[PDB]
Structures are given as C-alpha cells and as structure tokens.
Ligand binder design. Sequence first.
Ligand SMILES: CC1=CC(C)=[N+]2C1=Cc1ccc(CCC(=O)OC[C@@H](Oc3ccc(F)c(C(N)=O)c3F)c3nc(-c4ccc(C(F)(F)F)cc4)c(Br)o3)n1[B-]2(F)F
Ligand SMILES: Nc1nc2c(ncn2[C@@H]2O[C@H](COP(=O)(O)OP(=O)(O)O)[C@@H](O)[C@H]2O)c(=O)[nH]1
Ligand SMILES: [Ca+2]
Length: 308
Amino acid sequence: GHMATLKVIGVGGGGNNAVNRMIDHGMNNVEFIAINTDGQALNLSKAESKIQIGEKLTRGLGAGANPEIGKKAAEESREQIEDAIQGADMVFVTSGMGGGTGTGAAPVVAKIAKEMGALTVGVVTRPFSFEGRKRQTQAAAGVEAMKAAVDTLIVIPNDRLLDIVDKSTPMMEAFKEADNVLRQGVQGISDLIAVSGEVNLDFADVKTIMSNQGSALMGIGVSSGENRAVEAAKKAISSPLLETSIVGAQGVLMNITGGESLSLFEAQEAADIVQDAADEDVNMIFGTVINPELQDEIVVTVIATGFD
Ligand SMILES: CC1=CC(C)=[N+]2C1=Cc1ccc(CCC(=O)OC[C@@H](Oc3ccc(F)c(C(N)=O)c3F)c3nc(-c4ccc(C(F)(F)F)cc4)c(Br)o3)n1[B-]2(F)F
Ligand SMILES: Nc1nc2c(ncn2[C@@H]2O[C@H](COP(=O)(O)OP(=O)(O)O)[C@@H](O)[C@H]2O)c(=O)[nH]1
Ligand SMILES: [Ca+2]
C-alpha cells in the first residue's frame, strides 16, 4: 500500500497558464507537470516537471491551431509522457480546447495516463464564442476525444465567464475564477485521502464514482449560521461555470465537514438537497468529517457522475 498520489498536468497554453496560477496560489502534496510544444512558454513554467513535446515536429514553436500537430507531438513524445506520469494514482489533465496543442495533445496525454493505470480526470475549457465557429468546432472535436480518453470530464465553456464578470472585471481575474474548479477539486480529493473521516471516504470511493463515467460535476459549498447545511449543499452543486449540471446525476460522492456542532438533521438536509436537485435516485456515497478547528462553518463537497 501507499497514500494515493495526485498529479496535475497542463497541456498547451491555457493548461500551462492554469498550472502556473495554481502554483502561485499554493498547492501541497500534488506534482505539477507542464506539457507544451511551445518551448518559450515551457521555459517560463513554474512546474517542477516540464515536457517539450513535438520537438522534431514544431522545433519549439506552438502548433499554430492545427490539432493534428498537437496529437502527433504527444505521440512523438509518448515515452517522455509515460515517464512523467509513472506512479500517479490520479491524474488531472487541464487544457484549453480550440488551439493546436491542447486540442490534439491533451486526449493523448489522458489516454496514456489511463493506460498507465491512473484515474484520469480532464478539466477543459471551450473557447469563447467571440473566437468564432471554426475554433468552437475544433474544440468540440477535442472535447469528444477527451471524453473517449478520460475516466471523467469537466467542461467549462469560456462563455460562462461572461456571466460572472461586470464590464470592468480584469480578464486575468476571470481566468482565476475558472481555475478554482480544478484547484479546489484537487484540494478536496487530497483532503479526502489524507484524513480518516468519522464516516470515511477514501480513494477507492473516488474510483467507484469517477471510473469510466464521462461527464462530471465537481463543486464545493461553504456556509455558516442559520441554514448553513442547505446553503452549503446548494453552493456545492450549482456552479455558473460548468457545462454539466447536477440534474440527472446517478452517482454522487458527497462529503460534509463541520465542527463538533455538525448535526445529524443538517447532514440529512444537505444530502436531501443533492438528492432532489439531481431529480434522480442517486447512488450516494456519503462521508462526514468533524474538524474541531471549524467553529460555525460547514463545507459540502460533491462529485456527481452517471449522466450518460
Ligand atoms: C479559502 C477556503 C475556505 C474554506 C471553507 N475552503 C477554502 C478553500 C478550499 C479548497 C477546497 C475546499 C473544500 C474541500 C472539501 O471539503 O473536500 C472534501 C473532500 O472530502 C473529504 C475531505 C476530508 C475527509 F476526511 C473526507 C472523509 N469522509 O474522509 C472527505 F470525504 C472531497 N473532495 C471531493 C472531490 C471529488 C471529486 C473531485 C474531482 F474534481 F476530481 F472530480 C474533486 C474533489 C469530494 Br466529493 O469530497 N476549500 B474550503 F474548505 F471550502
Ligand atoms: N479560461 C481560460 N481559457 C484559456 C486560457 N488560455 C487559453 N484559453 C482558451 O484556450 C484556447 C486554446 O488556447 P491555447 O491553450 O493557448 O492553445 P494551445 O497552446 O495551442 O493548446 C483558446 O482559444 C482560449 O479559448 C486561460 O488561461 N484561461
Ligand atoms: Ca478519508
């Protein structure tokens, strides 16, 4: 045995960007890997591990919006990608769909990770509508290839970022909001592995809900005071940024963390919120953690799968 190990792999520009910002934000117990055709971007990566793919193919340039180049680049560097993944129990592959490198290389990276035995989760963006129909169509083909290669896929349409900004919100601030989805998902699973809960969930439960599943929702809700459990549950299952909503979920992993005041009744309330919002009979795998360092705060974390 061993404690399950997580790796986060950014593929292409947006994925590299997300890795850098996640490192800026602070992340423990996760190995970051930056993968790119673009050697200039890779040289600026904050990631401990860097893989320049397609050296012979692009000679250190990007893939110039041709997803076939990203795919061939990943295939040319297959052994390097294998060596960088080796040992991971879980791999998150993050990439912006629509360009040349991520669209083509990220599904190959995901396929390698899954063939190497890792639980493989993709977190990808679709391009803004203002980038045009061709970019959207190219990205859609990437999303489909991603879905065929991963265990579970989280898709963030970049157009959703236009729903959470005002007319002055800096573009980089909007990008950081999108980063929260992956980042807090990683932090949640890390905490799940590391702590023996009063009603415990561990990596085998993660595998049961996420293995070979397709579309997924991951979310988290923190609340306090009067209706804290219902509120936190509602916040966990309702991100404005995700393409896949909770509605239709057949499998759910749900954890509630609270202080010593965490009540049985409010645990039921929270679990019921997820049940009814799913509008399905949900196979729930339910966990609970008492963190006495919490006072009046409750945290609800949800991963939902089983839509397809
Ligand atoms: C700044 C700030 C204030 C507050 C309040 N916070 C902040 C920042 C962050 C960042 C993340 C969080 C909340 C994390 C969370 O609470 O996660 C619970 C985790 O579960 C656990 C955890 C421990 C256990 F002992 C057990 C168990 N019973 O042994 C247990 F179950 C959990 N992770 C997942 C999960 C499932 C799928 C996915 C994927 F994306 F991969 F698809 C990711 C995560 C689930 Br489902 O559950 N905060 B935050 F605390 F809100
Ligand atoms: N949300 C977000 N989307 C991004 C970011 N960077 C790029 N994108 C999106 O990702 C798409 C592909 O860009 P990029 O990753 O640079 O292309 P690649 O390097 O060829 O894979 C773009 O068309 C944008 O829609 C980012 O930092 N955040
Ligand atoms: Ca646990």
